[PDB]
């Protein structure tokens, strides 16, 4: 085997870098695109997605991309792909920033050979279920948000045509995600596509007179613009904010998490942080705020997927600035426009790329992450569930977990009949060497790899245990989990942020 | 020779494309840079310009760049170069967006072989004088703002290290030109450098805590940051706005110019325009405003180098938006921040590049330009003066002149003893085929190349003549100009926006 207790077949271990103790990085030639100059009399606006595919010269075997800022309300993905299928185009390589459940139509396109390769952060329930049963012949390549940005910039992947949805755009390409009848706020994942892709087709829901502003994607990165009745589901982003949890167990976990942060050697005036987008990982901000108020300390900035709780803090003057790569509710998207400058939009590359001139997460003091599983080696799994079926997402988990000065992975000891702590995770997305402190409702588990933290928290008034004790404490609740029946087909490869393979995922026998 | 009547030697006519009727454009591979990944523990802040040059690995023969947003108040250029000389580095290729008079120190660096090649928009009085007497062995390559952007993107030129001045920046590279003790507003010329250069060193005057915002240059484009006592002259940009002219002759020219615009088939609700930064070309906005008020027409946007007059219109609600590539006074730079979104910053490429997916000047309905000379073929000279000595600048002249629906070149019939209209210009920067209407104090001269304009203005109540009549009308004032004594050395090559040679400049003998 390799570094960790992973069974990665030599076929892939040799194809990709076989490892994931972190290594070194050296200079590289950034990817360059094939630009098609526009004549002063050329019209970049098109009538339909059809003509877009046409005038774009899309052929078999090419690679196309999409973003997931509209999440479950997305219409662009199913829209383009379907037209590609109808036009008899096949063997297309898909490179979406991430895949949601509304993207179910993808399954048939796979079965019929329209899509032959997929790469993204996650696949979620439906698409992931299919992929887990062996639908595709080739393995789905999963990359973290930073990994995707790294790959595109390193050119070890190249987008032929990027179909990007934009809630607003002029007839020349200037687009943004904060204006229109179907906004989504930031466009950080799409911004990188339009920057490295050869041809960019933005699909807008609302056409604005030239010049459109603000500008998240400049006319200089766009080739064609197509207007449609709707790019995303109306209320699918026009709803409201998601309040904190009420579950006492989660609130306790959140509170313990905040005590770890506010007692850490990083909690002081001008400290940075990133919290979750729901559950206990999100609630932690409530207790954190309280402690920040008791003291007169103020944080310099907040990152990640912003939520209303984050906007709340920016307005109360508790956090000076806020860097946004993705919004998780209408109010946060609104804030990106309302509190300009103080709430800034950033592309995924500036966000979490391991091979850049510098990422924001590199200035992050602490992050609060969640998990599906976590073994006695501190490895975290956010891809596969108990049944071994893919349904998660890599996101920026292994990304920030590494950059952050102190990584917190909080999660209930057990979920129903499924233990959150085990001796070995089914799939590895984030190496234990990146996890500093684990928080549960039973206490805190400090990674012995961080002796400086064990001492600093020595007197911390919170129950402390070993990761092994958490596992035993879990097994004593739902008993040893019943092993799953895995096949021999490699359903997908998990590429670590640095580009090497950290693990793999096999099919689940029917 | 060339299309026009320029005696461009075969040596250069063959080296570069020999022509300048406009041609066609085809797909190209955009330039890519050699990125040096930053380790999460790497510090990008340096102590001095010296260490910057050092850690940047600058060697002989490399190419470096600078921007001219600080104009005559710049300190960065002389700063870096001088340290390069002190360190014994030579045969350096200079690629500044433009050269001012304060850049006099350059002369000695040329004589001592420190700088062996130069490319930019202009050289102005001092540097230009030197170059005109044969100081450099190689010819200075002059390119329009668009040409420079085109060259850098086409990679037929490549920046090794870009030393950019920024009035504000964090210790990671996020910089802007609207915050700091020495602001300059927009950073459109520098923004392209940091995007295509291999290594970028920003020199700030004021260090701001991370993350800095707004962000004109992202941390992902910067390699090192160096803090100095001053990057630019204090009042050299902290002064005020420049009011209109008082010279009756100029005011008449301005007025005639406005009547041409307001009577053109482009004057209607939502029309775009760009006016000068001084003289009659600027004053034209006064009369224009009046006419726009009489009618209830409103312009969609204003472009170019913004002046307070422009901000004035944006506030009176007469112009909806304003795209800024360079500010020409403190108030305009201030407005770029004050009236956010409505006053937007744009990089030189998005501005006037002939080889892009689309430039703003391509949406420009009318532009008002000035000139040193203009022959009976409508060719315009903004490089050399009467004495044939270089002292001008290409700027965006030939750029917008071409993109604009209607190009106006206004200028007094004569300046002192020098005629503005002649039979042949010493140097050609903008081809007559791009000049539509010429405005003087004696009347208007419509280029016969625009028969649609001759008819539309048939009844325009303004004296109309032929370009030949303007010349004769000029010769009858200061007589035929006494020919200059030119040498045989090609002091510089003038590269047209498309990349080919339109003319050349020879040395002047005392």
PDB file of C-alpha atoms in Angstrom, chain A residues 118-346:
ATOM      1  CA  UNK A 118     -16.965  13.927 -15.151  1.00  0.00           C
ATOM      2  CA  UNK A 119     -14.973  16.080 -12.718  1.00  0.00           C
ATOM      3  CA  UNK A 120     -16.255  18.184  -9.806  1.00  0.00           C
ATOM      4  CA  UNK A 121     -16.598  18.756  -6.089  1.00  0.00           C
ATOM      5  CA  UNK A 122     -19.585  16.515  -5.563  1.00  0.00           C
ATOM      6  CA  UNK A 123     -22.352  14.546  -7.170  1.00  0.00           C
ATOM      7  CA  UNK A 124     -24.948  14.570  -4.357  1.00  0.00           C
ATOM      8  CA  UNK A 125     -27.721  12.000  -3.853  1.00  0.00           C
ATOM      9  CA  UNK A 126     -29.116  11.160  -7.312  1.00  0.00           C
ATOM     10  CA  UNK A 127     -26.133  11.552  -9.655  1.00  0.00           C
ATOM     11  CA  UNK A 128     -23.828  10.124  -7.001  1.00  0.00           C
ATOM     12  CA  UNK A 129     -26.113   7.107  -6.529  1.00  0.00           C
ATOM     13  CA  UNK A 130     -25.985   6.332 -10.230  1.00  0.00           C
ATOM     14  CA  UNK A 131     -22.190   6.737 -10.434  1.00  0.00           C
ATOM     15  CA  UNK A 132     -21.837   4.484  -7.409  1.00  0.00           C
ATOM     16  CA  UNK A 133     -23.630   1.656  -9.207  1.00  0.00           C
ATOM     17  CA  UNK A 134     -21.243   1.680 -12.148  1.00  0.00           C
ATOM     18  CA  UNK A 135     -23.168   3.774 -14.673  1.00  0.00           C
ATOM     19  CA  UNK A 136     -20.028   5.373 -16.179  1.00  0.00           C
ATOM     20  CA  UNK A 137     -17.218   3.379 -17.697  1.00  0.00           C
ATOM     21  CA  UNK A 138     -14.582   5.943 -16.715  1.00  0.00           C
ATOM     22  CA  UNK A 139     -14.043   7.034 -13.076  1.00  0.00           C
ATOM     23  CA  UNK A 140     -15.434  10.382 -11.945  1.00  0.00           C
ATOM     24  CA  UNK A 141     -12.505  12.647 -11.011  1.00  0.00           C
ATOM     25  CA  UNK A 142     -13.227  14.468  -7.783  1.00  0.00           C
ATOM     26  CA  UNK A 143     -11.230  17.564  -6.961  1.00  0.00           C
ATOM     27  CA  UNK A 144     -11.505  20.138  -4.149  1.00  0.00           C
ATOM     28  CA  UNK A 145     -12.477  23.705  -5.101  1.00  0.00           C
ATOM     29  CA  UNK A 146      -8.772  24.522  -4.940  1.00  0.00           C
ATOM     30  CA  UNK A 147      -7.826  21.371  -6.843  1.00  0.00           C
ATOM     31  CA  UNK A 148     -10.130  22.310  -9.699  1.00  0.00           C
ATOM     32  CA  UNK A 149      -8.665  25.785  -9.792  1.00  0.00           C
ATOM     33  CA  UNK A 150      -5.161  24.268  -9.629  1.00  0.00           C
ATOM     34  CA  UNK A 151      -5.868  21.806 -12.463  1.00  0.00           C
ATOM     35  CA  UNK A 152      -7.345  24.424 -14.771  1.00  0.00           C
ATOM     36  CA  UNK A 153      -4.443  26.790 -14.170  1.00  0.00           C
ATOM     37  CA  UNK A 154      -1.783  24.076 -14.493  1.00  0.00           C
ATOM     38  CA  UNK A 155      -3.443  23.117 -17.768  1.00  0.00           C
ATOM     39  CA  UNK A 156      -3.497  19.470 -16.829  1.00  0.00           C
ATOM     40  CA  UNK A 157      -7.122  19.993 -17.830  1.00  0.00           C
ATOM     41  CA  UNK A 158      -8.463  22.399 -20.487  1.00  0.00           C
ATOM     42  CA  UNK A 159     -11.965  23.733 -21.044  1.00  0.00           C
ATOM     43  CA  UNK A 160     -13.104  23.957 -24.649  1.00  0.00           C
ATOM     44  CA  UNK A 161     -16.386  25.687 -23.985  1.00  0.00           C
ATOM     45  CA  UNK A 162     -17.703  27.068 -20.737  1.00  0.00           C
ATOM     46  CA  UNK A 163     -21.448  27.524 -20.460  1.00  0.00           C
ATOM     47  CA  UNK A 164     -21.881  29.962 -17.564  1.00  0.00           C
ATOM     48  CA  UNK A 165     -25.166  31.158 -16.080  1.00  0.00           C
ATOM     49  CA  UNK A 166     -25.336  34.851 -15.130  1.00  0.00           C
ATOM     50  CA  UNK A 167     -28.349  36.560 -13.556  1.00  0.00           C
ATOM     51  CA  UNK A 168     -27.453  39.655 -15.617  1.00  0.00           C
ATOM     52  CA  UNK A 169     -25.325  40.532 -18.645  1.00  0.00           C
ATOM     53  CA  UNK A 170     -25.151  43.024 -21.513  1.00  0.00           C
ATOM     54  CA  UNK A 171     -25.021  42.004 -25.157  1.00  0.00           C
ATOM     55  CA  UNK A 172     -21.264  42.043 -25.022  1.00  0.00           C
ATOM     56  CA  UNK A 173     -20.520  39.804 -22.038  1.00  0.00           C
ATOM     57  CA  UNK A 174     -20.138  41.965 -18.898  1.00  0.00           C
ATOM     58  CA  UNK A 175     -22.006  39.863 -16.300  1.00  0.00           C
ATOM     59  CA  UNK A 176     -22.548  39.726 -12.550  1.00  0.00           C
ATOM     60  CA  UNK A 177     -24.460  37.666 -10.032  1.00  0.00           C
ATOM     61  CA  UNK A 178     -26.024  40.454  -8.014  1.00  0.00           C
ATOM     62  CA  UNK A 179     -28.459  41.913 -10.536  1.00  0.00           C
ATOM     63  CA  UNK A 180     -31.359  40.215 -12.299  1.00  0.00           C
ATOM     64  CA  UNK A 181     -34.540  38.278 -11.518  1.00  0.00           C
ATOM     65  CA  UNK A 182     -32.525  35.197 -10.652  1.00  0.00           C
ATOM     66  CA  UNK A 183     -29.452  36.301  -8.692  1.00  0.00           C
ATOM     67  CA  UNK A 184     -27.015  34.110  -6.762  1.00  0.00           C
ATOM     68  CA  UNK A 185     -24.524  36.666  -5.511  1.00  0.00           C
ATOM     69  CA  UNK A 186     -20.882  35.747  -5.951  1.00  0.00           C
ATOM     70  CA  UNK A 187     -19.616  33.994  -9.086  1.00  0.00           C
ATOM     71  CA  UNK A 188     -16.265  32.794  -7.773  1.00  0.00           C
ATOM     72  CA  UNK A 189     -16.393  29.340  -9.301  1.00  0.00           C
ATOM     73  CA  UNK A 190     -17.520  30.627 -12.715  1.00  0.00           C
ATOM     74  CA  UNK A 191     -14.965  33.449 -12.778  1.00  0.00           C
ATOM     75  CA  UNK A 192     -12.104  31.022 -13.142  1.00  0.00           C
ATOM     76  CA  UNK A 193     -13.820  29.208 -15.994  1.00  0.00           C
ATOM     77  CA  UNK A 194     -14.272  32.353 -18.033  1.00  0.00           C
ATOM     78  CA  UNK A 195     -10.648  33.175 -17.408  1.00  0.00           C
ATOM     79  CA  UNK A 196      -9.069  29.948 -18.653  1.00  0.00           C
ATOM     80  CA  UNK A 197     -11.644  28.450 -21.024  1.00  0.00           C
ATOM     81  CA  UNK A 198     -11.107  28.781 -24.768  1.00  0.00           C
ATOM     82  CA  UNK A 199     -14.666  29.763 -25.541  1.00  0.00           C
ATOM     83  CA  UNK A 200     -17.134  31.184 -23.026  1.00  0.00           C
ATOM     84  CA  UNK A 201     -20.907  31.253 -23.500  1.00  0.00           C
ATOM     85  CA  UNK A 202     -22.796  33.095 -20.764  1.00  0.00           C
ATOM     86  CA  UNK A 203     -26.540  32.306 -20.534  1.00  0.00           C
ATOM     87  CA  UNK A 204     -28.449  35.144 -18.951  1.00  0.00           C
ATOM     88  CA  UNK A 205     -31.922  35.453 -17.627  1.00  0.00           C
ATOM     89  CA  UNK A 206     -32.069  39.211 -17.916  1.00  0.00           C
ATOM     90  CA  UNK A 207     -30.422  41.359 -20.575  1.00  0.00           C
ATOM     91  CA  UNK A 208     -29.100  44.703 -19.429  1.00  0.00           C
ATOM     92  CA  UNK A 209     -28.109  47.711 -21.580  1.00  0.00           C
ATOM     93  CA  UNK A 210     -24.378  48.213 -22.119  1.00  0.00           C
ATOM     94  CA  UNK A 211     -22.272  48.579 -20.101  1.00  0.00           C
ATOM     95  CA  UNK A 212     -23.444  46.315 -17.275  1.00  0.00           C
ATOM     96  CA  UNK A 213     -21.966  46.859 -13.798  1.00  0.00           C
ATOM     97  CA  UNK A 214     -20.706  45.625 -11.388  1.00  0.00           C
ATOM     98  CA  UNK A 215     -18.635  43.286 -13.564  1.00  0.00           C
ATOM     99  CA  UNK A 216     -17.760  39.817 -12.262  1.00  0.00           C
ATOM    100  CA  UNK A 217     -17.018  38.477 -15.745  1.00  0.00           C
ATOM    101  CA  UNK A 218     -15.699  41.010 -18.328  1.00  0.00           C
ATOM    102  CA  UNK A 219     -16.687  41.173 -21.994  1.00  0.00           C
ATOM    103  CA  UNK A 220     -13.056  40.255 -22.739  1.00  0.00           C
ATOM    104  CA  UNK A 221     -13.631  36.735 -21.427  1.00  0.00           C
ATOM    105  CA  UNK A 222     -16.956  36.110 -23.149  1.00  0.00           C
ATOM    106  CA  UNK A 223     -17.598  34.900 -26.683  1.00  0.00           C
ATOM    107  CA  UNK A 224     -21.363  34.578 -26.891  1.00  0.00           C
ATOM    108  CA  UNK A 225     -24.417  35.623 -24.930  1.00  0.00           C
ATOM    109  CA  UNK A 226     -27.733  33.836 -25.052  1.00  0.00           C
ATOM    110  CA  UNK A 227     -30.915  35.011 -23.402  1.00  0.00           C
ATOM    111  CA  UNK A 228     -33.476  32.543 -22.031  1.00  0.00           C
ATOM    112  CA  UNK A 229     -36.752  32.720 -20.091  1.00  0.00           C
ATOM    113  CA  UNK A 230     -35.131  31.394 -16.882  1.00  0.00           C
ATOM    114  CA  UNK A 231     -31.680  30.205 -15.887  1.00  0.00           C
ATOM    115  CA  UNK A 232     -32.677  29.208 -12.399  1.00  0.00           C
ATOM    116  CA  UNK A 233     -35.682  28.385 -10.250  1.00  0.00           C
ATOM    117  CA  UNK A 234     -37.426  31.584  -9.016  1.00  0.00           C
ATOM    118  CA  UNK A 235     -37.714  31.042  -5.261  1.00  0.00           C
ATOM    119  CA  UNK A 236     -34.737  28.696  -5.546  1.00  0.00           C
ATOM    120  CA  UNK A 237     -32.631  31.671  -4.444  1.00  0.00           C
ATOM    121  CA  UNK A 238     -35.199  34.417  -3.796  1.00  0.00           C
ATOM    122  CA  UNK A 239     -36.115  32.896  -0.421  1.00  0.00           C
ATOM    123  CA  UNK A 240     -34.660  34.027   2.914  1.00  0.00           C
ATOM    124  CA  UNK A 241     -31.862  33.328   5.391  1.00  0.00           C
ATOM    125  CA  UNK A 242     -31.411  30.110   7.322  1.00  0.00           C
ATOM    126  CA  UNK A 243     -31.500  30.672  11.071  1.00  0.00           C
ATOM    127  CA  UNK A 244     -29.372  28.713  13.540  1.00  0.00           C
ATOM    128  CA  UNK A 245     -30.228  25.259  14.839  1.00  0.00           C
ATOM    129  CA  UNK A 246     -32.462  24.381  17.796  1.00  0.00           C
ATOM    130  CA  UNK A 247     -31.095  20.883  18.372  1.00  0.00           C
ATOM    131  CA  UNK A 248     -29.568  20.962  21.877  1.00  0.00           C
ATOM    132  CA  UNK A 249     -26.942  18.364  21.003  1.00  0.00           C
ATOM    133  CA  UNK A 250     -25.760  20.449  18.062  1.00  0.00           C
ATOM    134  CA  UNK A 251     -25.823  23.674  20.108  1.00  0.00           C
ATOM    135  CA  UNK A 252     -23.587  22.036  22.702  1.00  0.00           C
ATOM    136  CA  UNK A 253     -21.171  20.976  19.992  1.00  0.00           C
ATOM    137  CA  UNK A 254     -21.249  24.499  18.585  1.00  0.00           C
ATOM    138  CA  UNK A 255     -20.592  25.975  22.016  1.00  0.00           C
ATOM    139  CA  UNK A 256     -17.679  23.643  22.719  1.00  0.00           C
ATOM    140  CA  UNK A 257     -16.306  24.589  19.290  1.00  0.00           C
ATOM    141  CA  UNK A 258     -16.485  28.312  20.063  1.00  0.00           C
ATOM    142  CA  UNK A 259     -14.708  27.796  23.409  1.00  0.00           C
ATOM    143  CA  UNK A 260     -11.872  26.109  21.576  1.00  0.00           C
ATOM    144  CA  UNK A 261     -11.584  29.078  19.174  1.00  0.00           C
ATOM    145  CA  UNK A 262     -11.954  31.799  21.803  1.00  0.00           C
ATOM    146  CA  UNK A 263      -9.380  30.029  23.973  1.00  0.00           C
ATOM    147  CA  UNK A 264      -6.936  29.392  21.164  1.00  0.00           C
ATOM    148  CA  UNK A 265      -3.682  31.334  20.716  1.00  0.00           C
ATOM    149  CA  UNK A 266      -5.252  32.847  17.592  1.00  0.00           C
ATOM    150  CA  UNK A 267      -8.186  34.552  19.275  1.00  0.00           C
ATOM    151  CA  UNK A 268      -7.209  38.212  19.478  1.00  0.00           C
ATOM    152  CA  UNK A 269      -7.921  41.502  17.731  1.00  0.00           C
ATOM    153  CA  UNK A 270      -7.939  41.138  13.921  1.00  0.00           C
ATOM    154  CA  UNK A 271      -8.219  37.337  13.661  1.00  0.00           C
ATOM    155  CA  UNK A 272      -9.786  35.602  10.649  1.00  0.00           C
ATOM    156  CA  UNK A 273     -12.169  32.673  10.478  1.00  0.00           C
ATOM    157  CA  UNK A 274     -14.568  30.581   8.443  1.00  0.00           C
ATOM    158  CA  UNK A 275     -17.649  28.804   9.816  1.00  0.00           C
ATOM    159  CA  UNK A 276     -20.126  26.350   8.390  1.00  0.00           C
ATOM    160  CA  UNK A 277     -23.204  26.940   6.310  1.00  0.00           C
ATOM    161  CA  UNK A 278     -25.561  25.025   8.596  1.00  0.00           C
ATOM    162  CA  UNK A 279     -25.800  22.708  11.577  1.00  0.00           C
ATOM    163  CA  UNK A 280     -23.439  23.105  14.517  1.00  0.00           C
ATOM    164  CA  UNK A 281     -20.619  24.340  12.284  1.00  0.00           C
ATOM    165  CA  UNK A 282     -22.778  27.386  11.557  1.00  0.00           C
ATOM    166  CA  UNK A 283     -24.209  27.904  15.031  1.00  0.00           C
ATOM    167  CA  UNK A 284     -20.707  28.215  16.425  1.00  0.00           C
ATOM    168  CA  UNK A 285     -20.829  31.849  15.247  1.00  0.00           C
ATOM    169  CA  UNK A 286     -23.576  32.658  17.777  1.00  0.00           C
ATOM    170  CA  UNK A 287     -21.469  31.722  20.796  1.00  0.00           C
ATOM    171  CA  UNK A 288     -18.399  33.175  19.145  1.00  0.00           C
ATOM    172  CA  UNK A 289     -20.107  36.568  18.666  1.00  0.00           C
ATOM    173  CA  UNK A 290     -21.131  36.640  22.339  1.00  0.00           C
ATOM    174  CA  UNK A 291     -17.532  36.079  23.413  1.00  0.00           C
ATOM    175  CA  UNK A 292     -16.307  38.648  20.924  1.00  0.00           C
ATOM    176  CA  UNK A 293     -18.745  41.130  22.422  1.00  0.00           C
ATOM    177  CA  UNK A 294     -17.779  40.376  26.054  1.00  0.00           C
ATOM    178  CA  UNK A 295     -14.208  41.164  25.017  1.00  0.00           C
ATOM    179  CA  UNK A 296     -13.785  44.064  22.628  1.00  0.00           C
ATOM    180  CA  UNK A 297     -11.943  42.003  20.039  1.00  0.00           C
ATOM    181  CA  UNK A 298     -12.812  42.389  16.378  1.00  0.00           C
ATOM    182  CA  UNK A 299     -12.093  39.979  13.522  1.00  0.00           C
ATOM    183  CA  UNK A 300     -10.468  41.295  10.322  1.00  0.00           C
ATOM    184  CA  UNK A 301     -12.464  39.115   7.907  1.00  0.00           C
ATOM    185  CA  UNK A 302     -14.691  36.100   7.365  1.00  0.00           C
ATOM    186  CA  UNK A 303     -14.445  33.734   4.373  1.00  0.00           C
ATOM    187  CA  UNK A 304     -16.090  30.940   2.435  1.00  0.00           C
ATOM    188  CA  UNK A 305     -19.705  30.436   1.637  1.00  0.00           C
ATOM    189  CA  UNK A 306     -21.314  33.370   3.346  1.00  0.00           C
ATOM    190  CA  UNK A 307     -24.615  33.117   5.238  1.00  0.00           C
ATOM    191  CA  UNK A 308     -26.804  35.817   6.771  1.00  0.00           C
ATOM    192  CA  UNK A 309     -25.076  35.230  10.119  1.00  0.00           C
ATOM    193  CA  UNK A 310     -21.938  36.481   8.448  1.00  0.00           C
ATOM    194  CA  UNK A 311     -23.640  39.568   7.052  1.00  0.00           C
ATOM    195  CA  UNK A 312     -25.053  40.097  10.514  1.00  0.00           C
ATOM    196  CA  UNK A 313     -21.535  40.272  11.971  1.00  0.00           C
ATOM    197  CA  UNK A 314     -20.273  42.580   9.228  1.00  0.00           C
ATOM    198  CA  UNK A 315     -23.052  45.040  10.063  1.00  0.00           C
ATOM    199  CA  UNK A 316     -22.599  44.870  13.851  1.00  0.00           C
ATOM    200  CA  UNK A 317     -19.028  45.916  13.165  1.00  0.00           C
ATOM    201  CA  UNK A 318     -17.638  42.668  14.587  1.00  0.00           C
ATOM    202  CA  UNK A 319     -15.885  41.631  11.393  1.00  0.00           C
ATOM    203  CA  UNK A 320     -14.178  44.260   9.266  1.00  0.00           C
ATOM    204  CA  UNK A 321     -14.289  42.658   5.825  1.00  0.00           C
ATOM    205  CA  UNK A 322     -15.721  39.546   4.243  1.00  0.00           C
ATOM    206  CA  UNK A 323     -14.344  37.613   1.237  1.00  0.00           C
ATOM    207  CA  UNK A 324     -17.031  35.705  -0.676  1.00  0.00           C
ATOM    208  CA  UNK A 325     -16.538  32.826  -3.105  1.00  0.00           C
ATOM    209  CA  UNK A 326     -20.098  31.583  -2.825  1.00  0.00           C
ATOM    210  CA  UNK A 327     -23.331  32.677  -1.163  1.00  0.00           C
ATOM    211  CA  UNK A 328     -25.622  30.281   0.659  1.00  0.00           C
ATOM    212  CA  UNK A 329     -28.801  32.412   0.914  1.00  0.00           C
ATOM    213  CA  UNK A 330     -30.452  35.406  -0.735  1.00  0.00           C
ATOM    214  CA  UNK A 331     -29.535  37.921   1.997  1.00  0.00           C
ATOM    215  CA  UNK A 332     -25.825  37.083   1.645  1.00  0.00           C
ATOM    216  CA  UNK A 333     -26.011  37.548  -2.079  1.00  0.00           C
ATOM    217  CA  UNK A 334     -27.777  40.855  -1.453  1.00  0.00           C
ATOM    218  CA  UNK A 335     -25.090  41.968   0.978  1.00  0.00           C
ATOM    219  CA  UNK A 336     -22.402  41.409  -1.643  1.00  0.00           C
ATOM    220  CA  UNK A 337     -23.946  44.386  -3.370  1.00  0.00           C
ATOM    221  CA  UNK A 338     -25.238  46.455  -0.427  1.00  0.00           C
ATOM    222  CA  UNK A 339     -22.064  46.551   1.669  1.00  0.00           C
ATOM    223  CA  UNK A 340     -19.690  46.979  -1.300  1.00  0.00           C
ATOM    224  CA  UNK A 341     -15.928  46.867  -0.649  1.00  0.00           C
ATOM    225  CA  UNK A 342     -16.588  45.480   2.858  1.00  0.00           C
ATOM    226  CA  UNK A 343     -18.112  42.380   1.252  1.00  0.00           C
ATOM    227  CA  UNK A 344     -15.855  41.430  -1.688  1.00  0.00           C
ATOM    228  CA  UNK A 345     -16.236  38.815  -4.413  1.00  0.00           C
ATOM    229  CA  UNK A 346     -13.313  36.472  -5.137  1.00  0.00           C
TER     230      UNK A 346
END
